[PDB]
From Swiss-Prot, chain A:
Pfam family name, one: Phycobilisome
Natural source organism: Synechocystis sp. (strain ATCC 27184 / PCC 6803 / Kazusa)
NCBIfam families given in the database record: apcB
Family: Belongs to the phycobiliprotein family.
Claim: Transport is one of the keywords in the record: yes
Protein name: Allophycocyanin beta chain
Residue numbers binding (2R,3E)-phycocyanobilin: C81
GO BP term, pick one: photosynthesis
Membrane topology: Peripheral membrane protein
Function: Light-harvesting photosynthetic bile pigment-protein from the phycobiliprotein complex. Allophycocyanin has a maximum absorption at approximately 650 nanometers.
Keywords: Antenna complex, Bile pigment, Chromophore, Electron transport, Membrane, Methylation, Photosynthesis, Phycobilisome, Thylakoid, Transport
Positions of disulphide bridges: none
From Swiss-Prot, chain B:
Naturally occurring in which organism (per UniProt): Synechocystis sp. (strain ATCC 27184 / PCC 6803 / Kazusa)
Superkingdom, taxonomy of origin: Bacteria
Residues of the full protein shown: 649 to 697 of 896
Family assignment from sequence similarity: Belongs to the phycobilisome linker protein family.
Role summary: This protein is postulated to act both as terminal energy acceptor (by its phycobilin-like domains) and as a linker polypeptide (by its repeats and arms) that stabilizes the phycobilisome core architecture. Has intrinsic bilin lyase activity.
Complex and partners: Heterodimer of ApcF (a variant beta-allophycocyanin). Phycobilisomes of this organism are composed of a two cylinder core, from which six rods radiate. The core is mainly composed of allophycocyanin alpha and beta chains and of minor components.
Location of this chain's protein in the cell: Cellular thylakoid membrane
Protein name: Phycobiliprotein ApcE
Gene: apcE
Length: 161, 49
């Protein structure tokens, strides 16, 4: 796992070279985005449960998944799906705050598709739920922070697809 | 110069040549100076990837 600063540092180290102008510019860009990321993370922490609730309501209710036969049936499976969405939201917020997707790659994506295939859960339905979480988060946070969260959420969807 | 050549400056006195080619501009790096062949540091080369 690595934020933007650590990613730049590790890349420069692997080349065995100091922090040149490009690396300094990238670090300055991250520093400029830091306040935005902090405020967005605070807002999402404040409204984390509501975001998942609204996304599920507007994306994954009153359908076959909720109905018996769908993999969201029963309190157990519905809670598992809700916890999956909460995990997605929290880890996407982590990735947004760190300015890098390595945390998602090593803590989320690895084995996610394998477990989803093993348990037969709807990858398409999960993708749509992630979409709905994306719109809710964008609405709550704003435009630019919304896009920053959405890029990571779409990365999660692409990895899971 | 034959019957068809315009004359031209063929020789220069040393004083005139010095006036022309001894100013800060137009002075070669190697004329009256020890030119040390610049080379990257050996440790920099060793640590270079
Ligand atoms: C909800 C949007 C969709 C859905 C979800 C759902 N998932 C499971 C079970 C699992 N999901 C995971 C995935 C992860 N666990 C993690 O800790 C992380 C790391 C970031 C991920 C990605 C795992 C490991 C499981 C199995 C273990 C568990 O106890 O959850 C279920 C239940 C499956 C079952 O048989 O119990 C459900 C319902 N299902 C849908 O239909 C939605 C589209």
């Amino acid at each position: 796992m690595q934020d933007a600063i650590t990613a730049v540092i590790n890349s420069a180290d692997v080349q065995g070279k100091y922090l040149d102008g490009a690396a300094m510019d990238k670090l300055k860009s991250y520093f400029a985005s830091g306040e935005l990321r902090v405020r967005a993370a605070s807002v999402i922490s404040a409204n984390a449960a509501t975001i998942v609730k609204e996304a599920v309501a507007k994306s994954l209710l009153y359908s076959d998944v909720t109905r018996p036969g769908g993999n969201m049936y029963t309190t157990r499976r519905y809670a598992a799906c809700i916890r999956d969405l909460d995990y997605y939201l929290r880890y996407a917020t982590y990735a947004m705050l760190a300015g890098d997707a390595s945390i998602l790659d090593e803590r989320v994506l690895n084995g996610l598709k394998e477990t989803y295939n093993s348990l037969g859960v709807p990858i398409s339905s999960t993708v749509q739920a992630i979409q709905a979480i994306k719109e809710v988060t964008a609405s709550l946070v704003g435009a630019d922070a919304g896009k920053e969260m959405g890029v990571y959420l779409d990365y999660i969807c692409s990895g899971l697809s | 110069f034959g019957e068809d050549t315009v004359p031209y400056e063929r020789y220069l006195t040393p004083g005139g040549l010095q006036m022309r080619s001894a100013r800060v501009g137009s002075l070669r790096e190697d004329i009256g100076q020890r030119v040390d062949k610049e080379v990257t540091p050996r440790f920099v080369e060793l640590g270079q990837v």
